[PDB]
Amino acid sequence: DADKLPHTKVTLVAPPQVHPHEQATKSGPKVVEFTMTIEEKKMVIDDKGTTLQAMTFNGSMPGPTLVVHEGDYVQLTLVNPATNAMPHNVDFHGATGALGGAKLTNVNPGEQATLRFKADRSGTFVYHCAPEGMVPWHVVSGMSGTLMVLPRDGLKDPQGKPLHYDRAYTIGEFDLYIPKGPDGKYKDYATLAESYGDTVQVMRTLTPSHIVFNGKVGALTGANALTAKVGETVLLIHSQANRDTRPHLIGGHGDWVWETGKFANPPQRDLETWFIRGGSAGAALYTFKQPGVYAYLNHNLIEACELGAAGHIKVEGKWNDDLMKQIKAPAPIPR
């Protein structure tokens, strides 16, 4: 019985961080309490000033990542402030019943609700808004994130051997559908509701205008690059709630990857590129062996390099000449 159990309250953090948590744990099941507040807002999504009439959990794209253990109960208070215009709810793919919790969390502006469900299945799972009759629009406008349910005894390799990460990052990839006017410039809308009709028309073409990590072209670059150091193992959580993507770490690999994102299945090793089905979250472990600036991108290189689906990881440490060595630098072709 769930009412029997100890409760615990978690404080969420903004992507690309993930809130402090234990992997393998000696603790027994808890009721883990979270709160998220919906925020609609206009966001600038590229370096040319294009804006999106966006919708978010907790003010970020993606929403924050929620972490529990298998056998825990997730208890979410979802708040829809009166400063928003639309009704919202939440569908946890990690949950069983009631359209993922959507039927039990319909919240008009000025309302809130509390849902509990048992996290009985391990993996990274998408959660997203799913209001009746306007599902894709809320999703593509930014309302998704990841619930990670860790096995109580931590991650395992195909032979049952223990795996771990030293640091976790969460990347949400968003296919955006920004309309254009007769002058071929992207439209800027005064309200969310005004964007709707034109946006549906772009959606129906199936061609995103932009595809971005974490809300903006260049979100995970420069000062906001991810960081690591040689010897450290990183977990890269990648969610795409609406469209397929193909993550790749340039100069690296997926050492162990659950591309379907479900930790009771054996991971695959040595991946160059993996696949996140639209409507899922996946997870890759990599232990850094070389220092330098890596790119982490969607390996449809048009989607990455023209449309925005690419970030950076800056990795400290000592170069390893056994792994790779410039034998002869660029120099004239001798004749």
Place this chain on the structure above:
Amino acid sequence: DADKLPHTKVTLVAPPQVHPHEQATKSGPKVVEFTMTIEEKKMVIDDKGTTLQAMTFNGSMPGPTLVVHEGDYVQLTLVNPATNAMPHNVDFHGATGALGGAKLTNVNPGEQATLRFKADRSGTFVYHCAPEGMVPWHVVSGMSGTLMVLPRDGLKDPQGKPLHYDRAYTIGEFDLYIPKGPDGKYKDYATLAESYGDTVQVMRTLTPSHIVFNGKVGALTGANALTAKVGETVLLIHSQANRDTRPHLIGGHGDWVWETGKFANPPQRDLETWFIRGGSAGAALYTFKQPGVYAYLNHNLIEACELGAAGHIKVEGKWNDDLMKQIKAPAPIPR
């Protein structure tokens, strides 16, 4: 030798049902006899009256599902009535040789042919029409279905433990390419042959106008929803003969999934969303734990919700508060 074996005749049923059959079986190999009759016809595919000049096996999209066991021989009589206009044939992906049987089953209107092949490989396999020089058109116009070849000892989990379904449903997902006229309205054609040229032009854009389960937007909804009850295990066969899709059961999971559809491989568990490669059939088992109306859809939510790739499953039984509970219903945000 195949001429040695007992024959048996199977009566096919219309999707989304699958004809009566045994899973694990003590019977030895049989020659399993089927017949299908091709039917070209105009079909209404959406709620706005749009029509498709369609082509079908047995009058339905998809064609009916054929079920045998590994080691059986499939023996198909394919009939192309003189009331049709085009030549047809059939390519079984479950078969070895002769372009899947296409080279041996070329049938002009008024002809028929009988093919036999050995079902030596277990899984769900696409079959489709493949007339020389007009393959994609026949496929996208509706000519595909699934052959399911069960292992003689039934389905197995990754550890070799037995799995079963209590009920099987078959869903064919069809990317349709319906042309539009200068007024932006979909074209209605008096004959199949008249649709061809304009349809090729839409196909070459790679953008479907509609994407539908089982022939029509809303095919598997309302009175035609799929049904189950709590405690029952269902097999959801999903075929897509031309384009990738990503099945998802909202409020449920794929308990055991063979997304590539081949039962000698271990299934994956706990999937939120799986992937059916264009040109394949996949299969998922789920045991219902909560009652209610579920959506089964392609989790590109534009393809599902705007373009049509979505159906419903109405599930009887008792709600389970341990799995999920509304702790606090939607209600004003206290201040």
Place this chain on the structure above:
Amino acid sequence: DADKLPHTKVTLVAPPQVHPHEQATKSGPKVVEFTMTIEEKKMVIDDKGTTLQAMTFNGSMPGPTLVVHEGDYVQLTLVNPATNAMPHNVDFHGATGALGGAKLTNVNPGEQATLRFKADRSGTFVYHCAPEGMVPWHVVSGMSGTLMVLPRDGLKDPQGKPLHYDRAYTIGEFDLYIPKGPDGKYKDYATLAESYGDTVQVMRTLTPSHIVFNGKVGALTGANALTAKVGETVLLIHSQANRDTRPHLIGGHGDWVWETGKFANPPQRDLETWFIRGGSAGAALYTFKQPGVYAYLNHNLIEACELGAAGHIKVEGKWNDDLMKQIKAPAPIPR
């Protein structure tokens, strides 16, 4: 230490062949030396005379396949002749560090460089050009190929049993983005640099104009069909450096397939259709059981049959009536 090891020089061959090599080997690690020379050139890519301002490794699309064993070191001399116009480099997905070697191999026309890296991970891996700020264009214009790193003890099935191929073929699949002028005809450009701007615009639509194996519609057909005979096992290496594809052998199967392409993972068996993520190379084994002309294609049948992603394999040997038999040839429907 790598400087300790014996060196060996490999002579490359043009696709669809793969250079002579050993699978399981008693030899210890070597430094394997290769050379490739970049060639920019206009190529005719279809039967209607359309041209592409192409970029290639070694004059072919794809580049040639390089084969080593796990634990070897690849040592590549990359040469960019002064007759080319653009700078180039190379990113080996099989390598660790420095953006796959791209940062250490930047070569302007008239220069060359030599890179070494350790092939410490088994599988087929894409390599491609990745010049800063123009990555997708170089890739989609033809600059990719496969590095195959075999396990030292050869390929293995899921139970550790030995697998082999008798013959290997390499297929690169290229999504091309050829611009059109106001008359709706494809543009022919006098130089590579002149194609750039218009090509970017087509790329951003995400809709290829052509999708081809090995550089041209029909590249692997007629006199250039692949060949096999009944009883022979073939390895079909399939690379796609930019876009997803779904290989299928019509009338055959993937007997053992590593669709993610990484040989330390167990292969899947009996596949009808497999999936190569954009940015990866995959590998399938098939042992031929029937003679005849097979099609090997991308099973989005529009991409294959309208856009070009399809070739042929002509297989010698004796027909097998147990596997498949025409019981009754096409003939009038009796009444």
